[PDB]
Design a protein around this ligand. Structure first.
Ligand SMILES: NC(=O)c1ccc[n+]([C@@H]2O[C@H](COP(=O)([O-])OP(=O)(O)OC[C@H]3O[C@@H](n4cnc5c(N)ncnc54)[C@H](O)[C@@H]3O)[C@@H](O)[C@H]2O)c1
Ligand SMILES: NC(=O)c1ccc[n+]([C@@H]2O[C@H](COP(=O)([O-])OP(=O)(O)OC[C@H]3O[C@@H](n4cnc5c(N)ncnc54)[C@H](O)[C@@H]3O)[C@@H](O)[C@H]2O)c1
Ligand SMILES: NC(=O)c1ccc[n+]([C@@H]2O[C@H](COP(=O)([O-])OP(=O)(O)OC[C@H]3O[C@@H](n4cnc5c(N)ncnc54)[C@H](O)[C@@H]3O)[C@@H](O)[C@H]2O)c1
Ligand SMILES: NC(=O)c1ccc[n+]([C@@H]2O[C@H](COP(=O)([O-])OP(=O)(O)OC[C@H]3O[C@@H](n4cnc5c(N)ncnc54)[C@H](O)[C@@H]3O)[C@@H](O)[C@H]2O)c1
Ligand SMILES: Nc1ncnc2c1ncn2[C@@H]1O[C@H](CO)[C@@H](O)[C@H]1O
Ligand SMILES: Nc1ncnc2c1ncn2[C@@H]1O[C@H](CO)[C@@H](O)[C@H]1O
Ligand SMILES: Nc1ncnc2c1ncn2[C@@H]1O[C@H](CO)[C@@H](O)[C@H]1O
Ligand SMILES: Nc1ncnc2c1ncn2[C@@H]1O[C@H](CO)[C@@H](O)[C@H]1O
Lengths: 430, 430, 430, 430
């Protein structure tokens, strides 16, 4: 029970390494963190248990925490999101990794647990992207809690659960809600899904986007990026919403807002961008035009009533991996992607490296704070300082070559703000 | 010193009334406020002293506070923003108004003061769009303070000043920062300027936008709307910024971000969207291509070094009202609009009615809260509740015919939010 | 009957001249033609009878033909398109002009005739923008025909008529269909209306474009530009078409194509971009939403059933010049612009100078060809050579600063085309 | 030498059939052709020798000519474009096919030849996508010429060669230049590359498009679609052109036009869209930013100086199939895709089915004309009638659900055109 790592095939490393090379040039934030802190080794003594989809970009993250001098043990937060050659490299790198494609629920749980203990004791830091690493511990390894200094969550569902545990006096460790940074929120949510929604759809169906009517349920950040992605292609986007402010937003950009009920008749493509359930049900499926393409990029296979399909469907033919085509009792066909799960993760390579570098530099900064500024973070879920958000940004202005103008004493004075200090109030919405 | 009103020409009413008719159909918010509260007359006993550019939209605002039963005395917050026929109507309507186009600094001040006293005593409520109505009182009419229940500011410069006075124990009245509502911030800043930046430029120069290189300094809300407006026309927009998150924002939309110095060589059109000073100086002007069109939509004639022009310019020819053309010592001409002032306000009819309906419904709500819920607002600068913001929005979804989807018990539950209650956290940035 | 000119007020000149100055910097084409031919005076002995809306841009045109050494006599092709101060300048310039705003049908015809005879005999060249100058002659002044060397038409309706007369052996002069040049078709049709459709609507109604559903009948060039203009603002555009290729074109850009019948129910704004009649009829009007804004930019007040309005409308109130609002027997109002006429011409200053510079340089070239290469053009309607179209273009690449790459011997060869010669086949569609 | 077919693996069929099913729902044109002519069997007696990349869409094409009753023998016009499972199906279908992935030059030539003879004699009809099937015959099988009734080319390089042979009295068969139909040109060139440029780049590099500066050489149709594709993503596109009309075109859409020389310094991504050579050479490569991504979608590996790379490059590492990364003597890396060949064809699944359905229906129609109207087409290269172009379109308006408005006697008359007849002149450019 004392393995050094458990990946699909160690062989893949050489190639996995080829990728981490190309990818690193696209992740300025992490690479900067490496420069600025590789010497300081500000993470020494930290034993980080990371639970985040084991991909090429996470590899760059893992090697960045190590470079900042820290012990790390990783396990993918998803059973399918792993990239064996990515995990290959990290293993060959002499780093404990317990990740591989399509593992069983039992294997998953196993994987995570393998990151709990180091050879100098148990973990003292948690890096989560869903709270599985946090929940598991809190409820099965209470012992270790007193030994953990911090937790950095980056997911809505994880962050929330943190607020809950804290609200119910269960949280026994300070956490930093990384997800609510602007550079983390916008990228992981808006630019991220915008760049990879169609990729997922293309690789799956290779269908033409233009000229098609695409229904997008939810106008949040993710919904916004998808709506902008689909429209950039020539499709006519229709939006459904429950929040009147977001719905106004949509209408002001030219989209048509209506209910899924009315909408399910018009759509050609259907993307669900919510953390809500029962977005698309049988009464909708039976209205859809022949060969409608349904897929979800929200967060769980909980937005599409997949079950109904597998139930009220005549035949279910599998065109290919993660692309099935159900036959309705009315003659119409229904192309369902990723089996209802996240289409960009299930049909594409997830989000680009540059995007991840933004949400991941936030992650590296949370570790540093949490493990170097304990006094600053009492038990509760905290937010990263704004001056540090701007920091994640500025570190990316190089890659794309943008010349940032620098305020001047007079100006700064006039504005009443530090020439380098935070440039906006905390409630600023960008 | 006891006049009932002071407008340019009372005659204009008939026509001004023609406008308030057309205009009302474009301002659902306010018109809804009249429906929902015309009976309750929730503003009874309130004597509101309003200082907001006296336009056709403000007229609809004024008549809306009156319908909600309240005494009102108005004066434009600007010497040129007034629309004599709009002010005409309101006068004929038996409402004290002291506004007219281009008044003198002495007249302006005079105008404001005429709204201070009613025939039942002095004011008890303040509606400001710059803090001039607020400042003037606090420093020349301290008596009346104890008599004032609230203040509702809608301008950055006014809001700030409130925070200050409060910070220095000067503010002696609770205020509601109306400007930070989503439905007010976005419309008054983004959509507002987006709809009218080019209009002001067109009427002024009637120039062709497409094919031109337009330089926009500042990627805030206003900058965002102008950048989107100019690009929709075919211009190649370049942006300058001091904030690394806004600059990243820009770059992610395809714009080129650089410094004004480098930029002043390329630009054909120049729009300044900041609350900053010395954005465009002589060293820029002397770089600009022949016949460059310079104008500012920020907030004051403080962003362009007009002075330098009037100083280092050979001849200054006035093509027409609010449109001058300076001749440089190098052969290049410089078309300067609105004399450096707000171009949409000085070369156009400002923002549209529908937009105004949003930021103004917020205004009406602040009045009701502040004067119906004093207990709730101790002296300080407060924010309008979120459930109310959504309210301003929902009231506009009709005009544009958008079908809002309604959450369901199960859903609502799953999401952990009231089926009607606020759908988003307070830090939500939309 | 021998006046030297007939303009509204000669005084206006000083100001008209102010305009021609600013304007000339925006019309590189004509200004280049002036350089390249001011010396050659390639138009000597040519007596041009010009009939084109007498505006500031036409003035720059007029002075450009003269500079190329030619006698010119002008009359506007429209009774309202004229710009008195523009015509003023040209008169003070010692040039026969018979144009002024809103002249009577009898005055119009008069005006045209005054350009027929010079003090060395009658005209020998025709520059028409509607065929009124061409028709009039052919049927009332046959004598002069044998004396006229050429005709240059730039309008669909004028061009067609030429093809007809020619088809029926009536055409007695060679003509050059200038309208079908790329640089003239695209600018006068697409970029032209795109830049000024909304300006027209703003000045007229000052209404907010965003969030509205705009119906555009016809997806030709003009319709394409209007649809792109309206969408850049945030409106949701719907398109109607009779040609299946244009309709598919629309659908591939994300617009929704449907019939006016179904569309008339949704629309908030209505732009007709055809040369067809009966596009919007009573059965539509009685379907439109309250305060719908109807206007036409096609070519004649023949696309909207204005008549029906004036007939089946209860009351017709005139909000202001060129903006009326009919009241229907059902409670809905209808804002009708420019009285059914060209809205950009009737509510704005028409197209911008730079656009005009393109379609007018085409015009200047036709004159030169037709009058310097008679042998090349036998009686019939001809097209401007392609090498010359590219010429009109190359002449504008300077204003907007574009670095045109130059083919190289090896390349040119490989491509099989002249390094400077036409780069494209004649059926090329750009 | 009498094989019935030669494909990679016959087994693949079942799956290939799976595809042809899904695909057929996206190609309304061909599916319509099947309806309208399945009975007539208007192609009876025709023995078609098809040479077109053997993919899933060509499969649908092949089965469409057969359904119209015709013998067919196919061979891919490219050595790599073939799709073994697609070819699989067609073989299992009892159809002579000689296609498989990556065949040798000797094999290719062999494959083509296998379609020349049927069991009732040689071919009497040619369907070419490059003229390899035409050339080969004309120069090695002159006998058969007199036996061939028609040739339908769809490629620039093929069409041209036709005009040549004809110009040099070599062409001994009438041909129909299908490529110049609007529905074929626009789709195969504009919409086609627009939908699949980024897909090719994504699968290849999985790089993030937004925030990047993309250089596109050539503003033709393909260049136009690529430029619109990249911009919709958020990149800043810069264009290079030799044609002044296209360069103006670009500048009027907001792009920046300049020379490759100057541009090669700025670019992050480089797409070459010409039929020209030596677009990107060593002097450029040595200027490119680190990790620049170079790829070409023109028509041959002739636009990028690949050779130079393989010559002046230190090391060339192969990241993966069709994705190499050269290391320069200056430290910068250069990611070269598809080895310089067509990136959408070499890194993606080419163009979508719907697009192909357009350019392929054109193809089916040319066969019918050419083989049912010989008398109509004397030896020379002809264009498909316009009434038939609109036909290809109308046939697709269904899929996307667009309601085509139908002219009316009065209207039609007014317009002077047949209510169903062609709605536009031949020189119309859409
Ligand atoms: N797949 C990915 O790469 C990825 C990346 C980030 C986030 N996400 C997930 O996507 C989901 C949405 O994220 P977000 O940042 O846009 O959230 P968000 O909170 O900004 O927006 C969600 C939107 O859903 C709308 N909505 C809720 N219930 C609805 C219903 N029944 N019908 C229509 N609209 C409804 C809400 O009004 C809201 O505006 C989350 O579950 C999130 O974790 C996925
Ligand atoms: N004319 C109008 O109708 C109208 C309506 C609303 C607001 N405004 C005014 O416009 C201004 C901007 O408003 P906003 O809502 O976008 O503000 P904002 O705070 O959102 O953005 C201002 C932006 O300016 C940038 N900036 C500051 N100094 C700069 C400099 N020297 N060079 C380049 N960029 C610089 C900042 O980084 C910031 O992103 C304010 O003065 C505001 O009151 C005008
Ligand atoms: N106001 C201006 O500044 C200006 C400038 C140039 C041209 N025009 C005029 O605009 C008109 C259109 O010009 P264009 O260049 O786009 O012409 P166009 O020939 O390219 O397109 C006209 C379009 O109208 C469509 N159409 C015809 N009848 C229709 C109907 N009943 N319903 C729906 N669609 C219908 C046609 O299918 C066609 O695509 C002409 O009369 C032209 O002279 C006006
Ligand atoms: N890969 C595909 O799927 C696909 C599909 C259709 C066409 N094509 C090919 O793409 C190429 C271009 O097709 P198109 O329809 O756009 O052609 P096009 O003739 O419409 O445009 C080519 C453009 O290249 C420009 N150009 C030529 N030499 C240049 C140079 N040295 N520098 C800059 N610009 C230069 C020309 O001015 C012209 O506008 C052709 O070889 C064509 O066969 C590829
Ligand atoms: N390439 C990637 N590497 C790591 N995490 C990713 C990638 N693409 C998407 N994600 C993550 O997917 C999560 C949702 O499962 C998001 O929080 C997002 O950060
Ligand atoms: N038409 C209008 N009526 C009243 N205020 C306006 C109008 N257009 C713009 N404004 C105001 O101009 C202010 C800046 O001077 C903004 O806060 C905005 O709300
Ligand atoms: N400013 C202008 N000066 C001269 N002609 C114009 C102008 N704007 C539009 N036009 C002309 O309007 C004609 C249609 O009436 C078009 O052929 C176009 O060239
Ligand atoms: N999926 C496809 N099937 C067949 N031909 C294709 C496909 N995608 C692109 N092409 C062809 O690629 C050719 C250039 O090699 C184009 O003429 C185009 O029609």
């Amino acid at each position: 029970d004392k393995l050094p790592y458990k990946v699909a095939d160690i062989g893949l490393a050489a190639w996995g390494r080829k990728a981490l090379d190309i990818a690193e040039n696209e992740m300025p934030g992490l690479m900067r963190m490496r420069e600025m802190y590789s010497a300081s080794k500000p993470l020494k003594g930290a034993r980080i248990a990371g639970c985040l989809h084991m991909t090429v970009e996470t590899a760059v993250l893992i090697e960045t925490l190590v470079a900042l001098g820290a012990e790390v043990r990783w396990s993918s937060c998803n059973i399918f999101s792993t990239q064996d050659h990515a995990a290959a490299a990290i293993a060959k790198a002499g780093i404990p990794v317990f990740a591989w494609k399509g593992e069983t629920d039992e294997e998953y749980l196993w994987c995570i647990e393998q990151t709990l203990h180091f050879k100098d004791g148990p973990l003292n830091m948690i890096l989560d992207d869903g709270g599985d690493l946090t929940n598991l511990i809190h409820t099965k390894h209470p012992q270790l809690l007193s030994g953990i200094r911090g937790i950095s969550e980056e997911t809505t569902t994880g962050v929330h659960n943190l607020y809950k545990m804290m609200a119910n006096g269960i949280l026994k460790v300070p956490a930093i809600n990384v997800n609510d940074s602007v550079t983390n929120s916008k990228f992981d949510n808006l630019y991220g899904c915008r760049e990879s929604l169609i990729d997922g759809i293309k690789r799956a169906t290779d269908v033409m986007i233009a000229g098609k009517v695409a229904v997008v349920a939810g106008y949040g950040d993710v919904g916004k990026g998808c709506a902008q992605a689909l429209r950039g292609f020539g499709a006519r986007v229709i939006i459904t919403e429950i929040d009147p402010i977001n719905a106004l937003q949509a209408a002001m950009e030219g989209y048509e807002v209506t209910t899924m009920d009315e909408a399910c008749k018009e759509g050609n493509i259907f993307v669900t961008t919510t953390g809500c359930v029962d977005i698309i049900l049988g009464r909708h499926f039976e209205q859809m035009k022949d060969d409608a393409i349904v897929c979800n990029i929200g967060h769980f296979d909980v937005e599409i009533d997949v079950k109904w399909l597998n139930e009220n469907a005549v035949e279910k033919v599998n065109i290919k991996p993660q692309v099935d085509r159900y036959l309705l009792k009315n003659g119409h066909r229904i192309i369902l992607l990723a089996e209802g799960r996240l289409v960009n993760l299930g049909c594409a390579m997830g989000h680009p490296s540059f995007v991840m570098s933004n949400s991941f530099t936030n992650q590296v900064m949370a570790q540093i704070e949490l493990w170097t500024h304990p006094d600053k973070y009492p038990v509760g879920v905290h937010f990263l300082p704004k001056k540090l958000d701007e920091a994640v940004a500025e570190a990316h202005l190089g890659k794309l070559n943008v010349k940032l103008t620098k305020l001047t004493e007079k100006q700064a004075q006039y504005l009443g703000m530090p020439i380098n200090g935070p440039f906006k109030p905390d409630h600023y919405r960008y």
